Design a protein around this nucleic acid. Structure first.
Lengths: 324, 61
RNA sequence: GAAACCAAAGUCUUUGGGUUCCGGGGGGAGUAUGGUUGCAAAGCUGAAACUUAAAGGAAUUGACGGAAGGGCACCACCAGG
RNA sequence: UGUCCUACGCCGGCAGGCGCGGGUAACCCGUUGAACCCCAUUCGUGAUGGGGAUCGGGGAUUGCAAUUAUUCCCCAUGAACGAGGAAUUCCCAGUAAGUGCGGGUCAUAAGCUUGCGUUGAUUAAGUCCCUGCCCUUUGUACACCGCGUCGCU
């Protein structure tokens, strides 16, 4: 965990800004764009590599450092802590290969869920696609909670991380016996009708994605793949989902269906398928920005001054002298 | 309306995974309409097909 | 000739045909000040303190392409078990 | 495969003991007498007799020693498990898969590993979509514009 909270923020955000333009970031750029402390940043990077925060990269000529997955996770968690959202960690690990579930607790002690997108060419594309997936998933959760669907309340997001409302329960697959199958089944077709009314069709609406909150409430998650009803294949996905729910109910709980909704109703709800006149203070600020720009250029071109080549040349000269 | 067909010449393999065969079709309505269509599965020179609709023409040019 | 190139950028250490302007590592800086002209915009002349181990000019190979084409594989896919 | 592999008889529910023979091996195990599969009986869609774990008692081997069950045998308790999402492994014809057998450390200890036979298919004979890999041509030795307010000595 974190102990010192002074300059890992600035160095790691400098690494993040380095990753946005190119693969492997030299230390000169980090020292130029993180200018609060100078000289001691080498030992800061030496302290970061003892964890899995950053990683060195020196193959034949390129010499730099890159951000790892755990460093990005701690960066998002630090940004959440700056928002006063996470204080302690609950270790109920939902270990998935597409997402990691970590319980969090705020200063008030109220527990929330934390979704960390792990997607699995090097890992910069993995982190960027994780960021895009987290952004679109947060947008989808916001839309579904605005449309009053039975989903948790979204709380916050930071660049891959989603702090999300916590509801305890088990998925519908590993609940062997249900006392009232008919009521929750009718509610399931009610939710299917609601989703189809909202200009949306799931495509892979599975029972494993349905979490039984105390076997009384339905919790629904995992919408990166959410598609439109304007597609000609939309009703085929809708009928596939309906038949999947039907065969699951006549196959697992031994309960036979009574209502058979086959309605395509688009779009009677919201179309979510798209979803000295200048004062001297300004003069001072502009001149300060200019002089910081020239001194940042100077710091860049001074920090950009390969000792491995000089060491190899010295070794070659010494070997030529001692061998001839 | 359902029309019978005939394979005149197999042209090639099309599709993303190379799963479709682009073929030429001769009509059994005593007409010389040789229309280039796309089929799925194994076809050889001399096969006979059943077209649900004939007014559609496949990917030409 | 550093070369790309050049019948001139040749007749240059075998260095002198006449003559005008103009450069002296990169910045500061064509900046400040002074003078002068202009209605003005600005034009002409034009530093220093300080900063810096470099900045540049020609060519020579090609990691890496987010550049393009081909070929191969059920440790890739398609249709399947 | 074998000097621990076992043929035969007796005592045996039963693992196993007892008296006897062969085999340092195309000979004896061993026509290696296999298993799915087939042919008849019963069960009849339910946590069922499916599935067998986890426990309770006895018995017999292996070993100087089995208590933290070595192993097997005889009764009894019957759990989860109702065809399994995201994702992922292997596979082109005697092939996958089902089914048994043999070898490996070894006194008894084999859900591991490696080969062998038996029953034996669906699909495909196509492609660069995905995952990569291998070549050819071709150019190249982080620039500019879009991080801050206040506080005392």
């Amino acid at each position: 965990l974190r102990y010192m909270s002074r300059d890992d923020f600035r160095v790691l955000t400098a690494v993040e800004m380095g990753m946005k333009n190119h693969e492997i970031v030299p230390g000169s750029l980090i020292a130029s764009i993180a200018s609060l402390k100078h000289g001691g940043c080498n030992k800061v990077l030496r302290e970061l590599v003892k964890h899995k925060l950053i990683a060195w990269e020196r193959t034949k000529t390129v010499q730099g450092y890159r951000l790892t997955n755990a460093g990005y996770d701690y960066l998002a968690l630090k940004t959440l802590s700056s928002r006063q959202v996470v204080e302690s960690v609950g270790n109920q690990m939902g270990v998935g290969k597409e997402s990691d579930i970590y319980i969090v607790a705020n200063e008030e002690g109220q527990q929330f869920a934390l979704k960390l997108h792990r997607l699995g060419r090097h890992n910069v594309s993995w982190l960027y696609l994780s960021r895009l997936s987290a952004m679109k998933e947060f947008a989808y959760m916001k839309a579904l909670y605005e449309r009053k669907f039975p989903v948790p309340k979204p709380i916050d997001y930071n660049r891959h991380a989603v702090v999300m409302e916590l509801i305890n329960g088990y998925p519908l697959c590993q609940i062997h016996h249900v006392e009232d199958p008919a009521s929750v089944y009718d509610e399931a077709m009610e939710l299917i009708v609601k989703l189809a009314n909202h200009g949306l069709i799931h495509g892979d609406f599975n029972e494993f994605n349905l979490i039984l909150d105390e076997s009384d409430h339905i919790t629904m998650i995992d919408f990166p793949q959410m598609v439109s009803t304007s597609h000609p294949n939309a009703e085929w996905y809708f009928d596939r989902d309906v038949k999947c729910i039907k065969d699951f109910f006549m196959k697992r709980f031994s309960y036979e269906s009574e209502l058979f909704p086959t309605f395509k109703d688009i779009r009677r709800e919201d179309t979510l398928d798209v979803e000295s006149t200048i004062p001297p203070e300004l003069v001072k600020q502009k001149v300060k920005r200019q002089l910081t720009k020239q001194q940042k250029s100077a710091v860049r071109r001074r920090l950009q001054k390969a000792n491995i080549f000089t060491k190899q040349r010295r070794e070659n000269m010494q070997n030529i002298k001692s061998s001839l | 309306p359902i029309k019978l067909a005939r394979v005149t010449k197999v042209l090639g393999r099309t599709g993303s995974q190379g799963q479709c065969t682009q073929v030429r079709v001769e009509f059994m309505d005593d007409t010389s309409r040789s229309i280039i269509r796309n089929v799925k599965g194994p076809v050889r020179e001399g096969d006979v097909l059943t077209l649900l609709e004939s007014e559609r023409e496949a990917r030409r040019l």
